[model samples]
Target: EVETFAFQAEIAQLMSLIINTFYSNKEIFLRELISNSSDALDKIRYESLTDPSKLDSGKELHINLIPNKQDRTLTIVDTGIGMTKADLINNLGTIAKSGTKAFMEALQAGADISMIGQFGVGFYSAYLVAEKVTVITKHNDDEQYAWESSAGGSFTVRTDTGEPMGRGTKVILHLKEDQTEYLEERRIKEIVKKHSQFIGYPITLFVE
Candidate 1:
């Protein structure tokens, strides 16, 4: 099954604002993504405290980066809590409706934990480098789905017909011609080292 959804009116504007004015340094795209994934990893860890089964046989939680030179794309895959179809729409399609935000609220009311993404605009930073962004995600409770967009007025969500990702979320950024600097391994590592050095999970890049 496939469905198309429009970005909330505010989201379309917000995306443009993010790309043009919000971030001065485009390198921060990777940092925002890493922070989001780290939060996702934290969620799975926190959930496991209540239900051991949520840990899925103790799968190691880490973020993996794969930069494809020929494809001119950068892929970030994480063994973290993935998203459902609704999650895709609510969290990505609608601005400021981050699952992380809701999770943070729940934590604040009950207990405590640190998390990034206070404004819920962090994900849009991908547009700083990407012409199009594709997200494939699978939650334990839901079937896998792929959400894709060119950062225009609308995006699409479809049942993933490709090989299953097994678990977690994968984001692929189709880099713009001039933004190919991001495809460099050293460039990515330097950005990660500078901004995400304190992240709890491992951030590994595939190198041949």
Candidate 2:
């Protein structure tokens, strides 16, 4: 079994930078998320070829974009491989490749450090525009879990208290005022196609 560790200071700083500045185009948020969904779908599909029971649950592999103008929130949901609580913390809270120790070691060794792709950092990109983010996920091997964060140096992870969608993940982004352009159907579709059309999954948009 893998042991869990808290994020190192440098890892936290890296996350803050990604949430605050790494991305220039805010619309890329949709692209990054959809890319992740595509990866999940690929994983499940590959596994199902041998273990049909892996996909025994009735669910299609697709992406759903839900926009709430009243609350200024946009959510991208996927019926693919969901994440467990450990998967959530390990994937989102710390660096997946080198962890905090190695990341800092590289920095001290004069490495550029700017090119490193921290695992959990990608999902936190939602905070670039949203004040708060909520994730509803269910893993095939574990119970459901909900993770919420505001990029404020801390996050909350708990047992999900909602209907299980069998197996999938949903990322809800509560947009910032100036970042409302993402709420439009045309704009959302254009962004998805522009950057994610090649993704191996069907992407849908839900407008108010």
Candidate 3:
């Protein structure tokens, strides 16, 4: 089953502004995404401390950067605390619903706001280079779900039952023709090395 939701009025405007206004530094999308994954990993670790069952999956905590030149896509996968259906809607579908409020405050204060994760608007940065973004995620408490959007006025979330997804989130970015440089292994590694060298978890790149 699939459910579709329209972007809130403000969110649609913010997304457009984020993509067009922030085009000068398009590579920050990768940094923002990796930061989000790191946060997810931190959440799972903290949860596991109190409820050990959360770690029952036994999957090592890590992140994977996958490039598919044939498909012109870059995928960022994290074995972290994945989102449920509602989480997807709140986190991805709405702006103020997530961290964008802080993002705005920091922006207004003229703070460096480099982490972008603090603003929660970092995820939308994916639209900087991608024409389409798909998120496949599984949470320990809920079944796997997939959310997809073109950064248009709406997005869809649906139950996903293909190969089991263990427990984590996978974000696939269908790169625009001009943004294919991100699909290069060297470029991805360079970006990670510069922005996320100390992310506390393994961020592996799947080589061709």
Candidate 4:
């Protein structure tokens, strides 16, 4: 059930800007991912107030950063409101957060994203350090699925029955050969404290 989709012009433009300019500080990528995770958790928390069964009846809402220097991977897992198949296409395929494909060019030109919904598009920063990014998510209304991309203007999504990720989102980053600092637990914590300590959710750091 795996399928691939080509990227549109907006994605190409948005990424070209980051590749040429944002290379100066690749550490910001972690902050953006965790920030979006915090935003997702916030949405579920708010929805749970109305419907108690938004996710697993009562799962601890937190973010876990797992570093694997051996595989050169860093996984950021979150117990947040997961995305559906449509979300995967709209968010990753179109290089859009909902319908912001039209705004991507303008935003990438230098404006900052102020709305939480637009936050997901900030995943573009991931390309700075990671050569491959995998997103495995499970939503209450949808089956668990995996989204894979290599920052190459295209991505693929497939029906996944690998491991039960429960009801949340897990992002596994395969760091590029030149980006090893992210493999260090101390460096991750330093970046988290400096850029993402303000996140409302509890962000935990781990290594294995």
Candidate 5:
């Protein structure tokens, strides 16, 4: 059965804060994403060191940005450790443990564990530029699944048969009219250089 969840009252409030609070440099959201991607890659890599059977054990780690103006979407895909249904519910703040609060604590403590979706409530920053956001992810333990939200009070999670991801995550942002500036390769490159130049993994921007 497809599972549906609501953003707890507090999550909705923070979602409001994320969209309502403006960063003069809204592009910073891209950096936080890439930073999280690098961490994801690092996490899977760390685990593989001790147990070689982890997800994407032999693939090169990297981030890929695909911008499609026609569909009005920008996708951030990573060959990194990904989320399960449990992780999605916990980290997205739909069920419990407001992903934001955990993210802040993880950040302050410099956690050595996987904390990709937490966003320190930081992930929702994408809502500033996107009217809707979708996360398609595959993990070793489960089949591919899709999670989506419109930056509102609820989200949906269900099986995805559109295509197989093997192992990783794809975050698709349906851009707001004013946010299409991100579709330009020139802009994405500049933002990556500025915010994620030091990221350990290679970041690829794909525009076609």
Candidate 6:
């Protein structure tokens, strides 16, 4: 089924605030992306332990960072449980479903790790530094889909053509002028270790 949802007014304001102030450390973009990739790898690994078939296609759980200085862009790819079209819109465009609402609800009830995963605004955190973001994902259950956005309320979602990866997701970020530090190899590696060293999978960097 296909669907779309709008962000709450207060959440929109909170997003604007986060984009402007909280993400002052541009280097943290790498940390955020890597941390997210690590989480995806962890989820799939745990699932695979029970269902061996889950590892049938894109079984290699790893993170790769490819930087193109000429294009001034960075692409982070991961072989994990990718999302369908509905998952893309529901995951990226809207705010509440991101687990923020659930997190808040949990906090009101009392703190818990179950709520911790549901709490973060990691995906939207991409807008903290990227001027344009493109996500190409292929899920084991659905056709490949591409999600593109500038972090505004609206986004464009369409079917992708090239052969889909067995299972995974790729996020291409067009960095803003001031966010160029992320394009450096040393900087990227440092941030990854800082936030994701404890991650379950290997993270590789392809520098230009």
The per-prediction tally of clashing pairs is 0, 0, 0, 0, 4, 0
Screening candidate 6 with a backbone cut-off below 3 angstroms (N, C-alpha, C), the clashing residue pairs are none
Write model 6 residue lDDT over 139-184, tens digit each, in one string. 7778888777665555677788766677888899988888878889
Note the Cα lDDT for every prediction shown: 0.79, 0.73, 0.84, 0.78, 0.78, 0.71
Model 3 residue 131 CA deviation in Å: 0.6
Candidate 2 residue runs with Cα over 4 Å from true position: 1-7, 97-120
lDDT tens digits, residue span 1-208, model 3: 7898888876776677676664466888899999989999999999999999998875589999999999999999999999987778875555455566666567678764455666667788888899999999999989899898887789899998777778999999999999999988889989999988999999899997
Model 3: ten consecutive residues of lowest lDDT: 91-100
Model 3's alpha-carbon lDDT is 0.84
How well is each residue in 1-208 modelled by candidate 2, as lDDT tens digits?
3322345556566557656554556776677788778888888888889888989764489988899888888988898888888777765444443454555466568643332324333554566678888889988889888887666566677888787788989998988888888998889888877877787777777758
| Stretches of candidate 1 exceeding 4 Å from the true structure | 22-24, 91-117
- Which 10 successive residues of model 5 have the least lDDT summed? 112-121
- Model 4 steric clash total: 0
- How far is 35's C-alpha from truth in model 6 (Å)? 1.6
The pairs that clash in candidate 1 are none
Give the best candidate by TM-score.
3
In model 3, the Cα lDDT at residue 8 comes to 82
Model 4 pairs whose backbones collide: none
Clashes of 1: 0
* Best candidate according to lDDT: 3
Q: How accurate is candidate 5 locally (lDDT)?
A: 0.78
Q: What is candidate 2's TM-score against the reference? A: 0.82
Native-referenced Cα lDDT, model 4? 0.78
